[PDB]
Amino acid sequence: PGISSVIPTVLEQSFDNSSLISVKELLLNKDLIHPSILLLTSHLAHYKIVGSIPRCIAMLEVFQIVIKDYQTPKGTTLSRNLTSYLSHQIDLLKKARPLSVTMGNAIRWLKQEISLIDPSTPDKAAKKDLCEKIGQFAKEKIELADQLIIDNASTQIEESTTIVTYGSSKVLTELLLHNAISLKKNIKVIVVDSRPLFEGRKMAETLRNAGVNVMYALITSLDTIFNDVDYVFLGAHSILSNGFLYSRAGTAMLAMSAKRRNIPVLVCCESLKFSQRVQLDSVTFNELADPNDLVNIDYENPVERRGNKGALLNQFIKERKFEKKKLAMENKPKGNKIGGKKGSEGESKDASNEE
Template sequence: MTESETAAESKVESRAPEVKGEHAAETKKLTNKELKELKKKEKAAKRSAKKQENGVTVEEQQKLAQAKREKKRQQREHQQQQQRERELKNEAKQQKKRHIKKSTLFGHLETTEERRGTILALMSAITASQVSRITAAGLMVPTITSGSMVAKTPASSAGSSSDEVTSTAELAKSLATMNLESEEFSVVPGMSSIIPRATEQLFSPPQAVTSFKELLINKSLVHPAITLLTFQLANYKIVGSIPRCIAMLEAFQQVVKDYQTPHGTTLSRNLTSYLSHQIDILKKARPLSVTMGNAIRWLKQEISVIDPSTPDKEAKRILCEKIAQFAREKIELADQLIIDAGSQHVENGSTIVTYGSSKVVTDLLIYNAVELKKDFEVIVVDSRPLFEGRKMADRLRSRGVNVVYALITSLDSIFNMDVDYVFLGAHSILSNGFLYSRVGTAMLAMCAKRRNIPVLVCCESLKFSQRVQLDSVTLNELADPNDLVTIRPDNSSVDHSHDDLLSQFIKEREEQKKNSSQENKPNGKSSSPITVPPADDSKRNILDGWQNIHSLNIVNILYDLTPPEYIKKIITEFGSLPPSSVPVILREYKSLA
């Protein structure tokens, strides 16, 4: 090697670090994104070179890359399609839930619509000629097959016209011709039923499905007297704590008389379980009152102490006599003692205010007017939607009592009429002294307290409860919100003869038939559109269609709580006592009260 070549090589070697430094300087000027792209290209070039060495041409590599991109695109489209389907399902569920609303405050309480939905499905299964059966798909519920079921309900038999009964019976017969396997039916998960779509979500919670299945499995154990009483309670044909308890005891007497002890067991062991099935049905009509709960506990205690060696006929006779004695002592004799004690506060020329309708208060006023010949005036305060005070006012007027009827909206004017006493009935007296009674009682008691008017509560000890409650939200009963919507021109009381759920079902069936007939037209030609006459706005209720208004909820609560400081005394069969003495009665007379 010559000296010139050696010098050239040394120059190149000395120049190499300078070139590397310039290349590093250039890469430093690139952004992070550009650097990532550069590295991707370098890796792609290496992979391509490696594939070419393995015999894969550039065209084949491009085809493989295109197939991979197409596969990813199809996967994305499939995921988007699934997402759209889920959104449509959620929207359909939301549309269903709009039919049954619950307010935020009382959303934990069972609504009347939910109870009637269960009764509609349950009673259709009880009166069906088919038999409900359990299959692998769930519980199969037969359809309504008896036209007499609807025609014989208390709601339709009490005051309904013959045309309405006939149309209702024809409607039930048309329902009987439907086939369960038809695809037109809406199917409750785990159950095949004719329940309307509007009530499917009632059985969506697992505990509701379990409870409903248990009721249907034991439907053969339900006594006809209990079925009749359930309809009467659900339609508010029997209202009031004491009348409901008396009706229940009478039904239980009939149940005990017709009871037959199964082979291999005894009456004292099996009758309690048999009554539990009857009670479960009654709970679906309305929540049990405190008097009903106390009477049920007493009856189960009496059944448990029956000697197993006692013949069934003798045991049933003893139980029926005890039930009659219980009603006589705890209700009739107790009311007589309350009337005697309360009569001391009714004087000639006095003015008495009462609210709603209470059996013992009504008997007290009639006793003083008819038996004791006292001259006094009674102001009956009433409220929507049940208008119970009308019955009380009519009964008092028929017995010669001077009656003034007024609504609760005029309380200020009422208490400007020199009122002497306020007599109130009670649904229950809680152990902390609170009065649990018809909604509006607390407002009336508060107005009386502000004017120093004594508030007297007439209450049997059977209505005393061990429960402690500080508000009327935690435990209460929700009535039908449509009772507050409908205002009838004849000012009649609430009529529950028309079941909203059944009407909803008929509406859905008509829509399905109309849609199916249009789809089955030849050549896709639909029938001429039906012209609907314009609605008369003068006859339209402003709250019609409130279920479709998302921001509107109508709450019809039945009871409220009156604090003990508004109550002067409670008149019971044990005497007159302040609200603070209620726990003493519960403790000392626990076995009796």
């Protein structure tokens, strides 16, 4: 199977809902694992760019590739060990890093597809139509959905607007690009970034590469830029069946600020991002990473410096724990643009029954 247990850093007295560590350096691997999965795992382990949306697409692509490479054996049938393989892959993924609802949905869809086609049809003809179908699905629930979202944004966003964004959600970046080049509008895009992740920075860079006026913002200096700000979009990850946004980093604070100061908050989301599972706080299900990211002085990601920090077990009780994903409130984000055009966050799972 690989490597299990034996990890640095304590279990911690505060916040221990999920397991904290997993394979990063490859040693003794099974002689049946597809390299693309391994590469993906390697990437995710230390990624800066992707967040929720592109990850799922990547996964889908990988799956497609696997299917293309797969052929029906003489002894075992098409539906004999494929499911087992999928399960193994899932387990590997989980071991690497906790997964999203979209991925789960995709898995479910795949499972359904497996059941649908009966093991009697010609093998070459089977996968030919399968990969086409999967492509079609991808086009529909992602690209077309993105387009729909863009169009929704278009009718709502006024002439000459100031937008404040967080994270590295691809859809928002696409929207901003559209605003810049295709429609041609006056845009002021303020992007906020945190210590361990340089997603905001990346977004800013991307904007620059197009030709947009960008203000770089931080958590320490928030109130100075608001007091002027008209419209705020948040980096969406998943909407729960209560009306709460399970999202990345200090978006909740921003939302609170928005609520305090005049204008309501807006959220752009996909039709398949919705979850039937329910939770109402950050303590419920936390996504964790290694405290090794916050040791060095900032500036850039790879530095390797000698200074003062570099003790987790050496000094007299030192805990340096952080959270990657937090909870955003219910009443504060009201706007939701999805595959079913219009709706609010109070409307929690009306689209879930409609599918």
